[PDB]
Amino acid sequence: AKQNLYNAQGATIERSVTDRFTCGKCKEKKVSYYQLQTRSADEPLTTFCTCEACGNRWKFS
Amino acid sequence: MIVPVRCFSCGKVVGDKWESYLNLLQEDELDEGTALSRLGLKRYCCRRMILTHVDLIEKFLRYNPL
Amino acid sequence: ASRHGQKGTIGITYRREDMPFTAEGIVPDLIINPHAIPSRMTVAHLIEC
Numbered sequence: 001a002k003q004n005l006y007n008a009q010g011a012t013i014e015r016s017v018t019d020r021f022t023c024g025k026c027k028e029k030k031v032s033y034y035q036l037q038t039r040s041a042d043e044p045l046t047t048f049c050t051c052e053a054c055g056n057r058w059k060f061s
Numbered sequence: 062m063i064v065p066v067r068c069f070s071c072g073k074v075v076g077d078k079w080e081s082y083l084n085l086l087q088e089d090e091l092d093e094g095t096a097l098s099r100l101g102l103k104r105y106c107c108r109r110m111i112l113t114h115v116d117l118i119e120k121f122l123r124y125n126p127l
Numbered sequence: 128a129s130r131h132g133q134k135g136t137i138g139i140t141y142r143r144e145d146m147p148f149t150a151e152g153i154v155p156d157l158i159i160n161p162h163a164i165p166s167r168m169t170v171a172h173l174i175e176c
């Protein structure tokens with residue numbers, strides 16, 4: 001039963017952070033990011049943002 | 062093509078020096094960096110031209126027109 | 128353009144007497160903006176220079 005209860009609850013990806021930026025709404029430093037480039041080749045990555053103190057998302061160019 | 066006359070950067074006449082810089086490397090067996098130094102081109106904006114100019118003119122010239 | 132995908136065009140032209148100039152008097156042929164360096168990430172251009 002214990003193993004079944006463990007296998008029931010699923011994916012829990014956990015969003016590795018840093019502490020440099022502040023939240024756009026909460027204004028605290030628990031900020032987590034990602035990298036990839038979306039638009040054409042002439043520009044760099046997107047610098048995705050994800051706050052964790054409240055869950056906010058924003059972006060930096 | 063010939064050597065340019067008058068270095069684009071600086072303006073000093075170059076083109077007298079070409080065949081001299083050749084025979085500094087034919088019989089004198091001299092290293093070329095010292096060859097340009099003894100040719101007397103102490104700035105390097107002038108120096109790039111003699112060091113990098115290629116001579117296509119004779120490769121043109123080995124045709125037989127008229 | 129360079130050999131690194133730095134394509135661009137001529138804005139305007141200057142003569143020497145108002146081109147910037149170094150102590151030995153090597154007046155440059157052309158000047159490009161620094162901001163083309165970091166976002167293009169073109170290190171090898173600098174190494175080549």
Ligand SMILES: [Zn+2]
Nearest residue numbers: 023026051054
């Ligand atoms: Zn927040």
Ligand SMILES: [Zn+2]
Nearest residue numbers: 068071106107
């Ligand atoms: Zn020169």
